[PDB]
């Protein structure tokens, strides 16, 4: 009956179509309706109890086609529906929700690494561009806290980034925040107890296990306990006050590992694994 963690898409041998739901109360997994088009490097989010899958790329034996798609999944009917596509394809997109609107941040289309950002209004089924980031970012992690949206890390097409910036929707303005301690592309970014977390990622050479968090009051990033496994392109979400990380690539393997961070004890637990290893998933909870 409780909230489930949804994982959509991803990569193992080619881009994937899986939608599976995880119940952290017992570690069980439920396979649901496949996405209509495989994609890796997508994002997931939830608005009004509906799951959305946004952007990515279909890496298949035929091509490497970037996605502009937005698809909506209804857990009560187990059906995927197409929504309006974005202005441009966005592989390695970041997504956050403010007041019921979905913001699509950065990502790539062919050789283009975007700084542009657009927002979707579910009640009108429309996307419109808003102000661009100060930095081109793909592989960027996004989280929203008290109606400010953070874009953390990523890759600008030449440099992996430690920098981060914040969007102020009432001013349609982006402003740089303090940079992270570590360069991270493909990290998992989320918010928990008024801190923005960046877990794992890739610094240009190594997949990382380290985790740091940005305290909005102090404006400082501080390391917390490292995950049990190094990973980039991991899914991440918060469920019942704990962070969950799912899958990723560790420089050797496609992980099926899921771990759960308890912020009181500052510890990571190995919980029940994915049904198969994969990286570049979209995740959300409801």
């Amino acid at each position: 009956v409780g909230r489930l963690i949804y994982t959509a898409g991803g990569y193992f041998r080619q881009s994937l179509s899986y939608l599976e739901a995880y119940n952290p109360s017992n570690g069980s997994w439920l396979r649901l309706a496949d996405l209509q088009v495989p994609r890796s490097g997508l994002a997931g989010c939830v608005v009004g109890g509906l799951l959305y899958a946004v952007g990515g790329r279909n890496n298949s034996p035929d091509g490497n086609t970037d996605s502009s798609a937005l698809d909506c999944y209804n857990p009560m009917t187990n059906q995927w529906s197409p929504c309006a596509s974005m202005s441009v394809p966005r592989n390695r997109i970041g997504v956050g929700v403010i007041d019921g609107h979905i913001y699509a941040v950065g990502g790539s289309h062919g050789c283009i690494h975007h700084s542009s950002v657009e927002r979707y209004e579910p009640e009108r089924d429309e996307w419109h561009l808003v102000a661009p980031m100060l930095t081109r970012r793909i592989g960027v992690g996004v989280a929203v806290l008290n109606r400010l949206l953070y874009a953390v890390g990523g890759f600008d097409g030449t440099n992996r980034l430690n920098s981060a910036e914040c969007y102020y929707p009432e001013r349609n303005e982006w402003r740089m925040i303090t940079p992270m301690n570590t360069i991270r592309s493909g990290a998992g970014v989320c918010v928990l107890h008024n801190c923005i977390y960046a877990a794992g990622g890739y610094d240009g050479q190594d997949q990382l296990n380290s985790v740091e968090r940005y305290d909005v009051e102090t404006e400082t990033w501080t390391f917390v306990a490292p995950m049990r496994h190094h990973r980039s392109a991991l899914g991440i979400t918060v469920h019942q006050g704990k962070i969950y990380v799912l899958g990723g690539y560790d420089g050797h393997t496609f992980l099926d590992s899921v771990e759960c961070y308890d912020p009181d004890s500052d510890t990571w637990s190995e919980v029940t694994r994915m049904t198969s290893g994969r990286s570049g998933v979209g995740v959300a909870v409801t």
Binding site: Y11, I138, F254
Partner: peptide, 24 residues
Amino acid sequence: MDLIDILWRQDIDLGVSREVFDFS
């Protein structure tokens, strides 16, 4: 610095192989 290298570097941290981006 060619287009295969640029596309692959967008997914290198998923663990995707460069070979996946090269079609003859």
